[PDB]
């Protein structure tokens, strides 16, 4: 169930890479001298349809959790099955402490 | 830099008794 | 109803959508250069920078405000989902009856082993001449 | 986007069970 | 008194229908899907009546104590009392393997078939089912058999006694949750 | 840009719990739950819904459903912490019915030498020499476990023919009822046959019955022991099957001369 | 100021005897004894053991006399001087 919690991260923790996007844009505009000016235009484009496919993800995203919203019952009593060898488990105890008592009027006898 | 939800008859029966004792200046 | 709310979610998002648009244009609009016409330019150029500062914070804030409403519909997908619910359900009934079996096989070995001890007292006491 | 559902091939399913077509 | 039924048809792809049983146990008690098989037979009475007296008998191979089951339903109703169901007059009956042999001697015959097999889930009184349907050839095996078609053809059923109307606003209301997955209609059996 | 990098790198992580855990509903602006077993298959109209405060988190138990209370039998010869906040919650809410139930039973139902209730005091005179009382300890906060140890076993099976599939048969021309009055139509079964599978017996009856198996077989007990203590002139010998009912047993009692108990068979 | 509070604190004490007993009506009862009269915060009366299945007690308290307490005196039954059981 953590796929849905990975692509929030991966909206989220893309955002850092949004402003080193629009950071390595604007120094490179500011510079005089621009040999790479492929690398600012694909760093703009970049930056353009790279918030679109951002907003692809959020739509992937509720479509993928749209048609399923109903209530939901969470059926069948499993602690109190689970709960059933607890009472067990202090009968056995019962018992144990029973055998400690009997054991403990074992001692008496031996000394005399 | 709530209620108890038995008020309605409590405030009903406290009505009757301002009918009775009513506040008196 | 849900179609209503529905609704208000495609709006605000179609809304969040114009609004980085709109940001990023209005920036660049007023980047553009004209002649001067009886102006007095020296009033202008701070006028210009103190209206881009806006501009860009306006980029900041609806970064946050997506940052924002996408944490609204996140709770509101958590609570109405089917990856696991009708699986994850019946996967810890199976795993706890395996020690409930567990647990009845070692308490009928119990019970035999100490039904077998009973019967040797038992016999024991009968070894006696009682 | 994708057609699960198909009107006309639900058609031809309703009418091909009614009477003797598509058997011979 | 008579009783009567409530049919919804449609067909839905198999490849998407993963997610709508996903709603199935999110919503009614802790069932779980079954995938039965039955043998379905049509005869038919060639009595005096103009319409002829056609009924279809099922037979579960699978299950061991369910006997023939005989369904004689009506004609198509065009109703104001229900605009959205089929509204049928039927009269249903089990017997066992004295059925097959007792109609041979009215002249019930050949028609046609098909095989079903797949998923039943109720909540009260409406029974969702999505099954397979399968088409045989050379009509003397059962083992020659195909697909009918690839899209499950799904219905949706709710039996009342005679009377007792006033059904289609629950119908309707419980079909809202799931109208973004399935379109039920309220087909007629001709065209 | 360097604001919003670090506010960025657990409220989700515990809310993917409480879905899984328990049952989860939300309604207005605000997050609940029930704590009825309606999805258990209880048919008792009242709703445990509790609610969710974001604050780590809490959750917001109401009122109705706080302190602790138990059943306590007893014979006498006189005239996270979410997760344990909610079950806690629920066994005094599964309490409530409990003893509602079990204190209807006895005034609503005439009965042979009926019993009386005070508030939460069945006090019952089954013989004449006997009698036992019935307490709902409830603290709000000598006696045999194996009565109300059952007796939750008792409701939870009563819990499954609410919960089971034995009333959703397989055919479509079968939509539910047993498999014993589906074949009662075509096989027509034999008058014992009708009347044997139905069987509608309530709770208290089947207590007073394993309340008397436990002290008839205490009374034989009481004699076997009378007859070893005050006799042990051949040899006592009693043995117990290791298998037994909930009604009747089967026990062997050998009284054998001490020598020669090889020859008197 | 003693005989304000005097009124309406037995008056409250009426409050809630006569919300203690609507309280007990609703639940408790198998039905088969049931209430007769009922006023509001002056008396009570009961049937028991009734014609269907006839004796009543009637719960009245007076508008004086501080010193006592909700009236018990029976009404058709009039049971005999009982050492312990009227006394009780």
């Known amino acids: 169930l953590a796929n849905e919690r990975l692509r929030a991260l991966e909206d989220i923790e893309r955002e850092i890479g949004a402003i080193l996007q629009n950071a390595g844009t604007v120094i490179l505009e500011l510079s005089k001298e621009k040999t790479n000016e492929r690398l600012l235009d694909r760093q703009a484009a970049a930056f353009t349809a790279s918030v679109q496919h951002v907003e692809a993800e959020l739509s992937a995203q509720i479509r993928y959790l749209t048609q399923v919203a109903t209530g939901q019952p969470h059926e069948g009593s499993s602690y109190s099955s689970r709960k059933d060898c607890q009472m067990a488990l202090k009968r056995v105890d019962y018992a144990r402490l029973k055998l400690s008592d009997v054991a403990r009027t074992c001692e008496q006898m031996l000394e005399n | 830099f709530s209620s108890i939800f038995q008020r309605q008859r409590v405030d009903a029966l406290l009505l009757d008794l301002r009918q009775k004792f009513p506040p008196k200046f | ?32 250069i004209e002649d001067e016409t009886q102006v007095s330019r020296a009033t202008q150029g701070e006028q210009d920078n103190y209206e881009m500062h806006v501009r860009a914070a306006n980029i900041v804030r609806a970064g946050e405000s997506l940052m924002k409403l996408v944490s609204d519909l996140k709770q509101f997908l958590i609570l109405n989902d089917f990856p696991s619910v009708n699986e994850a359900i019946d996967q810890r009934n199976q795993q706890l009856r395996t020690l409930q079996e567990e647990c009845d096989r070692k308490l009928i070995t119990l019970r035999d082993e100490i039904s077998i001890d009973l019967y040797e007292l038992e016999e024991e006491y009968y070894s006696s001449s009682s | 986007n994708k057609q699960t559902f198909n009107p006309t091939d639900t058609n031809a399913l309703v009418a091909a069970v009614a009477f003797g077509k598509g058997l011979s | 008194i008579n009783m009567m039924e409530y049919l919804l048809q449609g067909s839905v792809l198999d490849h998407s229908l993963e997610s709508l049983i996903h709603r199935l146990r999110g919503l009614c008690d802790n069932m779980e899907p079954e995938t039965f098989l039955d043998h379905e037979m049509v005869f038919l009475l060639k009595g005096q009546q103009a319409s002829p007296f056609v009924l279809r008998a099922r037979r579960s191979m699978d299950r061991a104590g369910a006997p023939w089951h005989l369904r004689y339903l009506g004609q198509p109703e065009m109703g104001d009392k229900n605009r959205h169901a089929l509204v049928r007059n039927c009269v249903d009956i089990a017997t066992s393997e004295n059925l097959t042999d007792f109609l041979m001697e009215m002249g019930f015959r050949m028609d046609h078939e098909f095989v079903a097999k797949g998923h039943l889930f109720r909540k009260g009184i409406m029974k969702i089912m999505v099954y397979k349907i399968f088409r045989i050839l050379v009509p003397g095996n059962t083992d020659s058999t195909e697909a009918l078609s690839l899209s499950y053809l799904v219905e949706l059923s709710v039996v009342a006694p005679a009377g007792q109307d006033m059904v289609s606003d629950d119908m309707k209301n419980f079909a809202e949750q799931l109208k973004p997955l399935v379109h039920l209609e309220k087909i007629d059996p001709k065209r | 840009a360097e604001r ?5 790198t657990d409220f989700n992580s515990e809310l993917l719990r409480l879905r899984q855990h328990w049952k989860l509903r939300k309604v207005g602006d605000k ?14 109209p009242h709703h445990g819904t509790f609610e969710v405060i974001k604050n780590p988190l809490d959750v917001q138990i109401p009122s109705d459903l706080e302190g602790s209370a138990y059943i306590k039998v007893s014979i006498q010869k006189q005239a996270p912490h979410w997760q344990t906040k909610l079950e806690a919650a629920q066994n005094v809410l599964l309490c409530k019915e409990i003893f509602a139930q079990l204190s209807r039973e006895a005034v609503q139902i005439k009965s042979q030498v009926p019993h009386i209730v005070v508030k939460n005091q069945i006090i019952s005179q089954p013989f004449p020499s006997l009698q036992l009382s019935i307490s709902l300890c409830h603290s709000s906060n000598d006696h045999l476990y194996v009565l109300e140890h059952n007796l939750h076993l008792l409701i939870r099976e009563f819990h499954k023919q609410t919960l089971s599939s034995i009333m959703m048969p397989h055919p479509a021309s079968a939509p539910f009822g047993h498999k014993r009055m589906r074949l009662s139509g075509p096989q027509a079964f034999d008058k014992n046959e009708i009347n044997s599978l139905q069987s509608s017996e309530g709770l208290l009856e089947k207590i007073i019955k394993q309340a008397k198996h436990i002290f008839l077989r205490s009374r034989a007990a009481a004699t076997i022991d009378s007859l070893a203590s005050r006799i042990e002139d051949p040899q006592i010998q009693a043995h117990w099957s290791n298998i037994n009912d909930v009604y009747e047993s089967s026990v062997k009692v050998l009284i054998t001369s001490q020598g020669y108990e090889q020859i008197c068979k | 100021m003693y005989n304000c509070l005097h009124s309406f604190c037995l008056s409250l004490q009426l409050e809630v005897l006569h919300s203690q007993t609507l309280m007990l009506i609703r639940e408790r009862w198998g039905d088969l004894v049931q209430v007769e009269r009922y006023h509001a915060g002056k008396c009570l009366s009961l049937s028991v053991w009734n014609q269907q299945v006839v004796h009543k007690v009637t719960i009245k308290i007076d ?9 018990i005196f029976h009404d058709p039954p009039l049971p005999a001087s009982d050492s312990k059981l009227v006394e009780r």
């Open chain 6, 4 to 8: 919003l990098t670090k506010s960025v």
């Open chain 6, 31 to 44: 997050i609940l739950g029930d704590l009825s077993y309606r999805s258990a298959g209880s048919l008792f």
């Open chain 3, 1 to 32: 109803s849900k179609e209503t709310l529905l609704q208000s979610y495609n709006k605000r998002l179609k809304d969040d959508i114009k609004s980085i648009m709109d940001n990023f244009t209005e920036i660049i609009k007023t980047a553009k």
């Open chain 7, 63 to 71: 508008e004086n006399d501080v010193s006592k307490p909700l009236q």
